[PDB]
Amino acid sequence: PTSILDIRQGPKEPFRDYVDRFSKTLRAEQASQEVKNWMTETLLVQNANPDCKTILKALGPGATLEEMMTACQGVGGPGHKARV
Amino acid sequence: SILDIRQGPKEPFRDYVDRFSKTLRAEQASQEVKNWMTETLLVQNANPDCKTILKALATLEEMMTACQ
């Protein structure tokens, strides 16, 4: 989990599934808008799995969520969340 | 905002801690997030001299005695 601090990417978890869990927990999290933006720029890359973290760090902080997801697409296993 | 609380180059650590504590208590966040903010932002936003001491270090009283 009910805390944004506990949202961590699984070793085989697709980045899109991790982002969805992070987004849902952050929206429910009680914090100011600037703190939520800071939580995204800190915790999202920090709590990503080793493979995605390596990609995201090379990409830099000055990149959008769509650019992050495109760079991490297909990395890892299939996961357990059904999507179209 | 707690994010903007930064120690001055000549500002005593005790004065910085007082400003950090007052802003954190007024900040709207969960108890675990506030504890995490203390563990990350307090040392991170301290001046170069205090930051060097704090990284080598613990309770707040031990931090203030080491930075006095």
Side-chain angles (χ1 to χ4, degrees), chain B residues 13-51:
Chain B
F13 186 66
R14 286 182 195 269
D15 296 359
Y16 164 63
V17 158
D18 280 346
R19 294 196 297 105
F20 191 96
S21 180
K22 279 182 182 76
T23 313
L24 191 77
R25 282 174 194 183
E27 193 74 46
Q28 290 299 108
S30 76
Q31 202 61 42
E32 57 195 298
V33 160
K34 287 197 193 199
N35 292 320
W36 170 69
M37 276 169 173
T38 306
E39 287 174 20
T40 62
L41 297 167
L42 187 68
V43 176
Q44 189 194 289
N45 296 354
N47 64 30
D49 278 341
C50 290
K51 195 171 185 177

PDB file of all heavy atoms in Angstrom, chain B residues 13-51:
ATOM      1  N   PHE B  13      24.236  23.064  11.636  1.00  0.00           N
ATOM      2  CA  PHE B  13      23.436  21.858  11.405  1.00  0.00           C
ATOM      3  C   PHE B  13      22.161  21.802  12.246  1.00  0.00           C
ATOM      4  O   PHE B  13      21.132  21.346  11.745  1.00  0.00           O
ATOM      5  CB  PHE B  13      24.288  20.594  11.590  1.00  0.00           C
ATOM      6  CG  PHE B  13      23.607  19.293  11.228  1.00  0.00           C
ATOM      7  CD1 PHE B  13      23.255  19.014   9.912  1.00  0.00           C
ATOM      8  CD2 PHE B  13      23.350  18.331  12.198  1.00  0.00           C
ATOM      9  CE1 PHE B  13      22.623  17.814   9.578  1.00  0.00           C
ATOM     10  CE2 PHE B  13      22.742  17.119  11.861  1.00  0.00           C
ATOM     11  CZ  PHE B  13      22.385  16.866  10.552  1.00  0.00           C
ATOM     12  N   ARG B  14      22.224  22.302  13.501  1.00  0.00           N
ATOM     13  CA  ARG B  14      21.087  22.353  14.425  1.00  0.00           C
ATOM     14  C   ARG B  14      19.952  23.234  13.887  1.00  0.00           C
ATOM     15  O   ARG B  14      18.785  22.867  14.030  1.00  0.00           O
ATOM     16  CB  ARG B  14      21.528  22.788  15.834  1.00  0.00           C
ATOM     17  CG  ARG B  14      22.280  21.694  16.578  1.00  0.00           C
ATOM     18  CD  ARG B  14      22.681  22.100  17.982  1.00  0.00           C
ATOM     19  NE  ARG B  14      23.684  21.186  18.534  1.00  0.00           N
ATOM     20  CZ  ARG B  14      23.405  20.095  19.242  1.00  0.00           C
ATOM     21  NH1 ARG B  14      22.144  19.769  19.504  1.00  0.00           N
ATOM     22  NH2 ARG B  14      24.383  19.323  19.695  1.00  0.00           N
ATOM     23  N   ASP B  15      20.298  24.361  13.225  1.00  0.00           N
ATOM     24  CA  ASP B  15      19.340  25.284  12.610  1.00  0.00           C
ATOM     25  C   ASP B  15      18.683  24.632  11.390  1.00  0.00           C
ATOM     26  O   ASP B  15      17.475  24.766  11.206  1.00  0.00           O
ATOM     27  CB  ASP B  15      20.027  26.604  12.211  1.00  0.00           C
ATOM     28  CG  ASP B  15      20.582  27.427  13.364  1.00  0.00           C
ATOM     29  OD1 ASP B  15      20.436  26.998  14.532  1.00  0.00           O
ATOM     30  OD2 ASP B  15      21.158  28.501  13.099  1.00  0.00           O
ATOM     31  N   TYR B  16      19.480  23.906  10.579  1.00  0.00           N
ATOM     32  CA  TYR B  16      19.025  23.178   9.392  1.00  0.00           C
ATOM     33  C   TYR B  16      18.069  22.048   9.786  1.00  0.00           C
ATOM     34  O   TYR B  16      17.021  21.900   9.154  1.00  0.00           O
ATOM     35  CB  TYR B  16      20.237  22.655   8.592  1.00  0.00           C
ATOM     36  CG  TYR B  16      19.933  21.587   7.561  1.00  0.00           C
ATOM     37  CD1 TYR B  16      19.114  21.856   6.466  1.00  0.00           C
ATOM     38  CD2 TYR B  16      20.522  20.327   7.640  1.00  0.00           C
ATOM     39  CE1 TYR B  16      18.854  20.885   5.500  1.00  0.00           C
ATOM     40  CE2 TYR B  16      20.271  19.349   6.678  1.00  0.00           C
ATOM     41  CZ  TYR B  16      19.436  19.634   5.609  1.00  0.00           C
ATOM     42  OH  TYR B  16      19.186  18.678   4.655  1.00  0.00           O
ATOM     43  N   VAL B  17      18.419  21.280  10.847  1.00  0.00           N
ATOM     44  CA  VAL B  17      17.609  20.185  11.394  1.00  0.00           C
ATOM     45  C   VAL B  17      16.251  20.718  11.871  1.00  0.00           C
ATOM     46  O   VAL B  17      15.233  20.102  11.570  1.00  0.00           O
ATOM     47  CB  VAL B  17      18.373  19.383  12.487  1.00  0.00           C
ATOM     48  CG1 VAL B  17      17.425  18.627  13.417  1.00  0.00           C
ATOM     49  CG2 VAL B  17      19.364  18.422  11.850  1.00  0.00           C
ATOM     50  N   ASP B  18      16.243  21.876  12.573  1.00  0.00           N
ATOM     51  CA  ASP B  18      15.026  22.532  13.066  1.00  0.00           C
ATOM     52  C   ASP B  18      14.087  22.895  11.919  1.00  0.00           C
ATOM     53  O   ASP B  18      12.887  22.636  12.016  1.00  0.00           O
ATOM     54  CB  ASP B  18      15.364  23.778  13.906  1.00  0.00           C
ATOM     55  CG  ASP B  18      15.791  23.508  15.342  1.00  0.00           C
ATOM     56  OD1 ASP B  18      15.588  22.368  15.823  1.00  0.00           O
ATOM     57  OD2 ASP B  18      16.294  24.444  15.995  1.00  0.00           O
ATOM     58  N   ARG B  19      14.638  23.449  10.819  1.00  0.00           N
ATOM     59  CA  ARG B  19      13.874  23.818   9.622  1.00  0.00           C
ATOM     60  C   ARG B  19      13.346  22.570   8.909  1.00  0.00           C
ATOM     61  O   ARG B  19      12.204  22.575   8.447  1.00  0.00           O
ATOM     62  CB  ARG B  19      14.724  24.660   8.657  1.00  0.00           C
ATOM     63  CG  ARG B  19      15.120  26.034   9.190  1.00  0.00           C
ATOM     64  CD  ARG B  19      15.602  26.975   8.098  1.00  0.00           C
ATOM     65  NE  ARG B  19      16.827  26.515   7.434  1.00  0.00           N
ATOM     66  CZ  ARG B  19      16.870  25.984   6.215  1.00  0.00           C
ATOM     67  NH1 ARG B  19      15.755  25.833   5.508  1.00  0.00           N
ATOM     68  NH2 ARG B  19      18.025  25.594   5.696  1.00  0.00           N
ATOM     69  N   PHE B  20      14.178  21.502   8.835  1.00  0.00           N
ATOM     70  CA  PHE B  20      13.830  20.218   8.214  1.00  0.00           C
ATOM     71  C   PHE B  20      12.714  19.506   8.988  1.00  0.00           C
ATOM     72  O   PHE B  20      11.799  18.970   8.359  1.00  0.00           O
ATOM     73  CB  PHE B  20      15.070  19.310   8.067  1.00  0.00           C
ATOM     74  CG  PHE B  20      14.870  18.083   7.203  1.00  0.00           C
ATOM     75  CD1 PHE B  20      15.226  18.092   5.860  1.00  0.00           C
ATOM     76  CD2 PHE B  20      14.352  16.907   7.740  1.00  0.00           C
ATOM     77  CE1 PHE B  20      15.047  16.956   5.063  1.00  0.00           C
ATOM     78  CE2 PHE B  20      14.164  15.775   6.939  1.00  0.00           C
ATOM     79  CZ  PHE B  20      14.516  15.806   5.608  1.00  0.00           C
ATOM     80  N   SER B  21      12.796  19.500  10.337  1.00  0.00           N
ATOM     81  CA  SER B  21      11.815  18.878  11.232  1.00  0.00           C
ATOM     82  C   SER B  21      10.457  19.582  11.155  1.00  0.00           C
ATOM     83  O   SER B  21       9.434  18.904  11.057  1.00  0.00           O
ATOM     84  CB  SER B  21      12.331  18.870  12.670  1.00  0.00           C
ATOM     85  OG  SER B  21      11.406  18.276  13.566  1.00  0.00           O
ATOM     86  N   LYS B  22      10.453  20.935  11.187  1.00  0.00           N
ATOM     87  CA  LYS B  22       9.242  21.769  11.116  1.00  0.00           C
ATOM     88  C   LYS B  22       8.492  21.587   9.793  1.00  0.00           C
ATOM     89  O   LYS B  22       7.268  21.447   9.805  1.00  0.00           O
ATOM     90  CB  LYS B  22       9.581  23.252  11.335  1.00  0.00           C
ATOM     91  CG  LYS B  22       9.735  23.642  12.797  1.00  0.00           C
ATOM     92  CD  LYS B  22      10.013  25.134  12.948  1.00  0.00           C
ATOM     93  CE  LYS B  22      10.214  25.552  14.387  1.00  0.00           C
ATOM     94  NZ  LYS B  22      11.554  25.161  14.905  1.00  0.00           N
ATOM     95  N   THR B  23       9.231  21.552   8.666  1.00  0.00           N
ATOM     96  CA  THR B  23       8.667  21.375   7.326  1.00  0.00           C
ATOM     97  C   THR B  23       8.133  19.946   7.131  1.00  0.00           C
ATOM     98  O   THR B  23       7.078  19.785   6.517  1.00  0.00           O
ATOM     99  CB  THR B  23       9.673  21.818   6.246  1.00  0.00           C
ATOM    100  OG1 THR B  23      10.212  23.091   6.608  1.00  0.00           O
ATOM    101  CG2 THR B  23       9.047  21.917   4.856  1.00  0.00           C
ATOM    102  N   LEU B  24       8.843  18.923   7.668  1.00  0.00           N
ATOM    103  CA  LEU B  24       8.436  17.514   7.571  1.00  0.00           C
ATOM    104  C   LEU B  24       7.146  17.230   8.351  1.00  0.00           C
ATOM    105  O   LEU B  24       6.309  16.461   7.875  1.00  0.00           O
ATOM    106  CB  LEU B  24       9.562  16.565   8.026  1.00  0.00           C
ATOM    107  CG  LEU B  24       9.367  15.069   7.734  1.00  0.00           C
ATOM    108  CD1 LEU B  24       9.628  14.748   6.274  1.00  0.00           C
ATOM    109  CD2 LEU B  24      10.258  14.229   8.601  1.00  0.00           C
ATOM    110  N   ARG B  25       6.992  17.847   9.540  1.00  0.00           N
ATOM    111  CA  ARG B  25       5.801  17.700  10.383  1.00  0.00           C
ATOM    112  C   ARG B  25       4.575  18.312   9.700  1.00  0.00           C
ATOM    113  O   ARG B  25       3.483  17.749   9.787  1.00  0.00           O
ATOM    114  CB  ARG B  25       6.029  18.315  11.774  1.00  0.00           C
ATOM    115  CG  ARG B  25       6.868  17.426  12.688  1.00  0.00           C
ATOM    116  CD  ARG B  25       7.217  18.100  13.998  1.00  0.00           C
ATOM    117  NE  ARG B  25       8.278  17.377  14.702  1.00  0.00           N
ATOM    118  CZ  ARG B  25       8.747  17.704  15.903  1.00  0.00           C
ATOM    119  NH1 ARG B  25       8.249  18.746  16.557  1.00  0.00           N
ATOM    120  NH2 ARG B  25       9.714  16.989  16.460  1.00  0.00           N
ATOM    121  N   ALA B  26       4.774  19.440   8.986  1.00  0.00           N
ATOM    122  CA  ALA B  26       3.737  20.150   8.236  1.00  0.00           C
ATOM    123  C   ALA B  26       3.450  19.486   6.879  1.00  0.00           C
ATOM    124  O   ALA B  26       2.362  19.676   6.329  1.00  0.00           O
ATOM    125  CB  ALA B  26       4.142  21.602   8.034  1.00  0.00           C
ATOM    126  N   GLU B  27       4.423  18.711   6.347  1.00  0.00           N
ATOM    127  CA  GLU B  27       4.326  17.996   5.069  1.00  0.00           C
ATOM    128  C   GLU B  27       3.249  16.910   5.135  1.00  0.00           C
ATOM    129  O   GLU B  27       3.168  16.183   6.125  1.00  0.00           O
ATOM    130  CB  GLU B  27       5.691  17.372   4.703  1.00  0.00           C
ATOM    131  CG  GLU B  27       5.814  16.863   3.274  1.00  0.00           C
ATOM    132  CD  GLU B  27       5.940  17.920   2.193  1.00  0.00           C
ATOM    133  OE1 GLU B  27       6.732  18.873   2.371  1.00  0.00           O
ATOM    134  OE2 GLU B  27       5.274  17.769   1.145  1.00  0.00           O
ATOM    135  N   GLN B  28       2.420  16.813   4.084  1.00  0.00           N
ATOM    136  CA  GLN B  28       1.367  15.806   4.015  1.00  0.00           C
ATOM    137  C   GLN B  28       1.907  14.552   3.345  1.00  0.00           C
ATOM    138  O   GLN B  28       2.115  14.530   2.130  1.00  0.00           O
ATOM    139  CB  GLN B  28       0.099  16.344   3.322  1.00  0.00           C
ATOM    140  CG  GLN B  28      -0.670  17.398   4.130  1.00  0.00           C
ATOM    141  CD  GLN B  28      -1.184  16.888   5.458  1.00  0.00           C
ATOM    142  OE1 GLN B  28      -0.674  17.245   6.525  1.00  0.00           O
ATOM    143  NE2 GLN B  28      -2.202  16.039   5.425  1.00  0.00           N
ATOM    144  N   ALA B  29       2.206  13.531   4.164  1.00  0.00           N
ATOM    145  CA  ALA B  29       2.761  12.242   3.746  1.00  0.00           C
ATOM    146  C   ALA B  29       2.532  11.191   4.827  1.00  0.00           C
ATOM    147  O   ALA B  29       2.300  11.544   5.986  1.00  0.00           O
ATOM    148  CB  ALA B  29       4.256  12.381   3.471  1.00  0.00           C
ATOM    149  N   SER B  30       2.628   9.899   4.454  1.00  0.00           N
ATOM    150  CA  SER B  30       2.489   8.783   5.390  1.00  0.00           C
ATOM    151  C   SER B  30       3.709   8.752   6.321  1.00  0.00           C
ATOM    152  O   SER B  30       4.741   9.348   5.995  1.00  0.00           O
ATOM    153  CB  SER B  30       2.357   7.462   4.637  1.00  0.00           C
ATOM    154  OG  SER B  30       3.602   7.026   4.115  1.00  0.00           O
ATOM    155  N   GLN B  31       3.590   8.070   7.475  1.00  0.00           N
ATOM    156  CA  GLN B  31       4.667   7.969   8.459  1.00  0.00           C
ATOM    157  C   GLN B  31       5.928   7.296   7.901  1.00  0.00           C
ATOM    158  O   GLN B  31       7.033   7.753   8.200  1.00  0.00           O
ATOM    159  CB  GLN B  31       4.178   7.287   9.748  1.00  0.00           C
ATOM    160  CG  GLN B  31       5.023   7.599  10.990  1.00  0.00           C
ATOM    161  CD  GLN B  31       5.072   9.068  11.370  1.00  0.00           C
ATOM    162  OE1 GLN B  31       4.070   9.795  11.330  1.00  0.00           O
ATOM    163  NE2 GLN B  31       6.246   9.529  11.772  1.00  0.00           N
ATOM    164  N   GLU B  32       5.766   6.240   7.076  1.00  0.00           N
ATOM    165  CA  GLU B  32       6.896   5.532   6.465  1.00  0.00           C
ATOM    166  C   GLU B  32       7.601   6.377   5.393  1.00  0.00           C
ATOM    167  O   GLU B  32       8.821   6.276   5.249  1.00  0.00           O
ATOM    168  CB  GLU B  32       6.508   4.133   5.947  1.00  0.00           C
ATOM    169  CG  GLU B  32       5.367   4.081   4.944  1.00  0.00           C
ATOM    170  CD  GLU B  32       4.793   2.691   4.744  1.00  0.00           C
ATOM    171  OE1 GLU B  32       5.540   1.793   4.287  1.00  0.00           O
ATOM    172  OE2 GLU B  32       3.592   2.498   5.042  1.00  0.00           O
ATOM    173  N   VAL B  33       6.839   7.231   4.675  1.00  0.00           N
ATOM    174  CA  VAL B  33       7.376   8.144   3.660  1.00  0.00           C
ATOM    175  C   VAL B  33       8.191   9.254   4.349  1.00  0.00           C
ATOM    176  O   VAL B  33       9.275   9.595   3.871  1.00  0.00           O
ATOM    177  CB  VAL B  33       6.277   8.665   2.689  1.00  0.00           C
ATOM    178  CG1 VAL B  33       6.704   9.938   1.962  1.00  0.00           C
ATOM    179  CG2 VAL B  33       5.887   7.584   1.686  1.00  0.00           C
ATOM    180  N   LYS B  34       7.697   9.764   5.499  1.00  0.00           N
ATOM    181  CA  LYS B  34       8.379  10.786   6.304  1.00  0.00           C
ATOM    182  C   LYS B  34       9.710  10.261   6.853  1.00  0.00           C
ATOM    183  O   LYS B  34      10.692  11.003   6.866  1.00  0.00           O
ATOM    184  CB  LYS B  34       7.486  11.295   7.445  1.00  0.00           C
ATOM    185  CG  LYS B  34       6.352  12.190   6.973  1.00  0.00           C
ATOM    186  CD  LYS B  34       5.756  12.981   8.120  1.00  0.00           C
ATOM    187  CE  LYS B  34       4.451  13.613   7.720  1.00  0.00           C
ATOM    188  NZ  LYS B  34       4.075  14.725   8.630  1.00  0.00           N
ATOM    189  N   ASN B  35       9.743   8.977   7.282  1.00  0.00           N
ATOM    190  CA  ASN B  35      10.954   8.311   7.782  1.00  0.00           C
ATOM    191  C   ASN B  35      11.965   8.158   6.642  1.00  0.00           C
ATOM    192  O   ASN B  35      13.162   8.369   6.847  1.00  0.00           O
ATOM    193  CB  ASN B  35      10.623   6.941   8.391  1.00  0.00           C
ATOM    194  CG  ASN B  35       9.827   6.986   9.676  1.00  0.00           C
ATOM    195  OD1 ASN B  35      10.041   7.830  10.556  1.00  0.00           O
ATOM    196  ND2 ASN B  35       8.927   6.029   9.840  1.00  0.00           N
ATOM    197  N   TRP B  36      11.468   7.824   5.434  1.00  0.00           N
ATOM    198  CA  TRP B  36      12.263   7.672   4.216  1.00  0.00           C
ATOM    199  C   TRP B  36      12.820   9.027   3.756  1.00  0.00           C
ATOM    200  O   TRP B  36      13.954   9.084   3.276  1.00  0.00           O
ATOM    201  CB  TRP B  36      11.424   7.003   3.118  1.00  0.00           C
ATOM    202  CG  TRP B  36      12.047   7.008   1.755  1.00  0.00           C
ATOM    203  CD1 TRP B  36      13.147   6.310   1.349  1.00  0.00           C
ATOM    204  CD2 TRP B  36      11.592   7.743   0.614  1.00  0.00           C
ATOM    205  NE1 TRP B  36      13.402   6.561   0.023  1.00  0.00           N
ATOM    206  CE2 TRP B  36      12.453   7.424  -0.459  1.00  0.00           C
ATOM    207  CE3 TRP B  36      10.509   8.609   0.380  1.00  0.00           C
ATOM    208  CZ2 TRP B  36      12.286   7.964  -1.738  1.00  0.00           C
ATOM    209  CZ3 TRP B  36      10.325   9.116  -0.895  1.00  0.00           C
ATOM    210  CH2 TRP B  36      11.209   8.799  -1.936  1.00  0.00           C
ATOM    211  N   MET B  37      12.031  10.109   3.927  1.00  0.00           N
ATOM    212  CA  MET B  37      12.430  11.480   3.593  1.00  0.00           C
ATOM    213  C   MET B  37      13.597  11.927   4.479  1.00  0.00           C
ATOM    214  O   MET B  37      14.506  12.597   3.992  1.00  0.00           O
ATOM    215  CB  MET B  37      11.248  12.446   3.741  1.00  0.00           C
ATOM    216  CG  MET B  37      10.354  12.498   2.527  1.00  0.00           C
ATOM    217  SD  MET B  37       8.822  13.384   2.885  1.00  0.00           S
ATOM    218  CE  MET B  37       8.119  13.456   1.282  1.00  0.00           C
ATOM    219  N   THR B  38      13.583  11.526   5.769  1.00  0.00           N
ATOM    220  CA  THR B  38      14.636  11.829   6.743  1.00  0.00           C
ATOM    221  C   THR B  38      15.929  11.096   6.352  1.00  0.00           C
ATOM    222  O   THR B  38      16.991  11.706   6.345  1.00  0.00           O
ATOM    223  CB  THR B  38      14.164  11.485   8.169  1.00  0.00           C
ATOM    224  OG1 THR B  38      12.931  12.155   8.432  1.00  0.00           O
ATOM    225  CG2 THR B  38      15.187  11.857   9.239  1.00  0.00           C
ATOM    226  N   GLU B  39      15.815   9.805   5.990  1.00  0.00           N
ATOM    227  CA  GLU B  39      16.928   8.943   5.579  1.00  0.00           C
ATOM    228  C   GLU B  39      17.576   9.368   4.257  1.00  0.00           C
ATOM    229  O   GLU B  39      18.767   9.116   4.065  1.00  0.00           O
ATOM    230  CB  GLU B  39      16.459   7.485   5.469  1.00  0.00           C
ATOM    231  CG  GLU B  39      16.218   6.796   6.803  1.00  0.00           C
ATOM    232  CD  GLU B  39      15.622   5.401   6.724  1.00  0.00           C
ATOM    233  OE1 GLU B  39      15.719   4.760   5.651  1.00  0.00           O
ATOM    234  OE2 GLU B  39      15.068   4.941   7.748  1.00  0.00           O
ATOM    235  N   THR B  40      16.801   9.981   3.342  1.00  0.00           N
ATOM    236  CA  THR B  40      17.318  10.385   2.033  1.00  0.00           C
ATOM    237  C   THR B  40      17.660  11.872   1.930  1.00  0.00           C
ATOM    238  O   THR B  40      18.810  12.196   1.642  1.00  0.00           O
ATOM    239  CB  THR B  40      16.382   9.955   0.885  1.00  0.00           C
ATOM    240  OG1 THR B  40      15.111  10.587   1.035  1.00  0.00           O
ATOM    241  CG2 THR B  40      16.218   8.445   0.787  1.00  0.00           C
ATOM    242  N   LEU B  41      16.679  12.766   2.164  1.00  0.00           N
ATOM    243  CA  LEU B  41      16.818  14.215   1.988  1.00  0.00           C
ATOM    244  C   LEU B  41      17.673  14.958   3.023  1.00  0.00           C
ATOM    245  O   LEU B  41      18.320  15.931   2.634  1.00  0.00           O
ATOM    246  CB  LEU B  41      15.440  14.899   1.889  1.00  0.00           C
ATOM    247  CG  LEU B  41      14.553  14.513   0.694  1.00  0.00           C
ATOM    248  CD1 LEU B  41      13.129  14.997   0.899  1.00  0.00           C
ATOM    249  CD2 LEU B  41      15.104  15.071  -0.616  1.00  0.00           C
ATOM    250  N   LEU B  42      17.655  14.556   4.315  1.00  0.00           N
ATOM    251  CA  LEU B  42      18.411  15.253   5.374  1.00  0.00           C
ATOM    252  C   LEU B  42      19.923  15.295   5.111  1.00  0.00           C
ATOM    253  O   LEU B  42      20.525  16.365   5.205  1.00  0.00           O
ATOM    254  CB  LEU B  42      18.093  14.685   6.773  1.00  0.00           C
ATOM    255  CG  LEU B  42      18.680  15.405   8.006  1.00  0.00           C
ATOM    256  CD1 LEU B  42      18.067  16.783   8.204  1.00  0.00           C
ATOM    257  CD2 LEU B  42      18.452  14.592   9.260  1.00  0.00           C
ATOM    258  N   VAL B  43      20.520  14.146   4.760  1.00  0.00           N
ATOM    259  CA  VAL B  43      21.950  14.035   4.458  1.00  0.00           C
ATOM    260  C   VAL B  43      22.231  14.619   3.061  1.00  0.00           C
ATOM    261  O   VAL B  43      23.185  15.382   2.904  1.00  0.00           O
ATOM    262  CB  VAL B  43      22.472  12.576   4.634  1.00  0.00           C
ATOM    263  CG1 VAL B  43      23.939  12.450   4.237  1.00  0.00           C
ATOM    264  CG2 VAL B  43      22.277  12.089   6.069  1.00  0.00           C
ATOM    265  N   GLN B  44      21.380  14.285   2.067  1.00  0.00           N
ATOM    266  CA  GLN B  44      21.477  14.728   0.669  1.00  0.00           C
ATOM    267  C   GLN B  44      21.515  16.253   0.518  1.00  0.00           C
ATOM    268  O   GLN B  44      22.303  16.766  -0.280  1.00  0.00           O
ATOM    269  CB  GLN B  44      20.304  14.146  -0.144  1.00  0.00           C
ATOM    270  CG  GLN B  44      20.381  14.333  -1.657  1.00  0.00           C
ATOM    271  CD  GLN B  44      19.055  14.031  -2.313  1.00  0.00           C
ATOM    272  OE1 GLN B  44      18.618  12.876  -2.401  1.00  0.00           O
ATOM    273  NE2 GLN B  44      18.381  15.068  -2.788  1.00  0.00           N
ATOM    274  N   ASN B  45      20.663  16.968   1.276  1.00  0.00           N
ATOM    275  CA  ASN B  45      20.544  18.422   1.201  1.00  0.00           C
ATOM    276  C   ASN B  45      21.376  19.177   2.254  1.00  0.00           C
ATOM    277  O   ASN B  45      21.267  20.401   2.354  1.00  0.00           O
ATOM    278  CB  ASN B  45      19.072  18.837   1.231  1.00  0.00           C
ATOM    279  CG  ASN B  45      18.276  18.350   0.033  1.00  0.00           C
ATOM    280  OD1 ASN B  45      18.813  17.780  -0.927  1.00  0.00           O
ATOM    281  ND2 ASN B  45      16.974  18.569   0.060  1.00  0.00           N
ATOM    282  N   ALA B  46      22.249  18.464   2.989  1.00  0.00           N
ATOM    283  CA  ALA B  46      23.153  19.088   3.958  1.00  0.00           C
ATOM    284  C   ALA B  46      24.316  19.734   3.187  1.00  0.00           C
ATOM    285  O   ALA B  46      24.581  19.331   2.048  1.00  0.00           O
ATOM    286  CB  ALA B  46      23.679  18.041   4.933  1.00  0.00           C
ATOM    287  N   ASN B  47      25.001  20.736   3.786  1.00  0.00           N
ATOM    288  CA  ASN B  47      26.135  21.412   3.141  1.00  0.00           C
ATOM    289  C   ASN B  47      27.333  20.441   2.932  1.00  0.00           C
ATOM    290  O   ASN B  47      27.338  19.391   3.581  1.00  0.00           O
ATOM    291  CB  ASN B  47      26.523  22.713   3.879  1.00  0.00           C
ATOM    292  CG  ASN B  47      27.039  22.573   5.294  1.00  0.00           C
ATOM    293  OD1 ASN B  47      27.657  21.575   5.682  1.00  0.00           O
ATOM    294  ND2 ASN B  47      26.862  23.627   6.078  1.00  0.00           N
ATOM    295  N   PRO B  48      28.321  20.725   2.035  1.00  0.00           N
ATOM    296  CA  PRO B  48      29.410  19.751   1.795  1.00  0.00           C
ATOM    297  C   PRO B  48      30.125  19.190   3.027  1.00  0.00           C
ATOM    298  O   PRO B  48      30.380  17.984   3.064  1.00  0.00           O
ATOM    299  CB  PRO B  48      30.376  20.519   0.893  1.00  0.00           C
ATOM    300  CG  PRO B  48      29.509  21.458   0.151  1.00  0.00           C
ATOM    301  CD  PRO B  48      28.460  21.893   1.138  1.00  0.00           C
ATOM    302  N   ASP B  49      30.427  20.042   4.028  1.00  0.00           N
ATOM    303  CA  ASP B  49      31.115  19.637   5.258  1.00  0.00           C
ATOM    304  C   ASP B  49      30.284  18.698   6.120  1.00  0.00           C
ATOM    305  O   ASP B  49      30.787  17.643   6.517  1.00  0.00           O
ATOM    306  CB  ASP B  49      31.598  20.858   6.060  1.00  0.00           C
ATOM    307  CG  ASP B  49      32.908  21.464   5.580  1.00  0.00           C
ATOM    308  OD1 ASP B  49      33.660  20.767   4.858  1.00  0.00           O
ATOM    309  OD2 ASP B  49      33.200  22.619   5.957  1.00  0.00           O
ATOM    310  N   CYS B  50      29.013  19.055   6.385  1.00  0.00           N
ATOM    311  CA  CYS B  50      28.117  18.219   7.183  1.00  0.00           C
ATOM    312  C   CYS B  50      27.784  16.909   6.477  1.00  0.00           C
ATOM    313  O   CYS B  50      27.792  15.867   7.128  1.00  0.00           O
ATOM    314  CB  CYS B  50      26.861  18.980   7.590  1.00  0.00           C
ATOM    315  SG  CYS B  50      27.153  20.278   8.820  1.00  0.00           S
ATOM    316  N   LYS B  51      27.562  16.953   5.142  1.00  0.00           N
ATOM    317  CA  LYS B  51      27.264  15.781   4.303  1.00  0.00           C
ATOM    318  C   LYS B  51      28.375  14.724   4.408  1.00  0.00           C
ATOM    319  O   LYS B  51      28.067  13.539   4.547  1.00  0.00           O
ATOM    320  CB  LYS B  51      27.042  16.203   2.839  1.00  0.00           C
ATOM    321  CG  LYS B  51      26.388  15.140   1.967  1.00  0.00           C
ATOM    322  CD  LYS B  51      25.999  15.710   0.614  1.00  0.00           C
ATOM    323  CE  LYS B  51      25.232  14.720  -0.224  1.00  0.00           C
ATOM    324  NZ  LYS B  51      24.795  15.317  -1.513  1.00  0.00           N
TER     325      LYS B  51
END
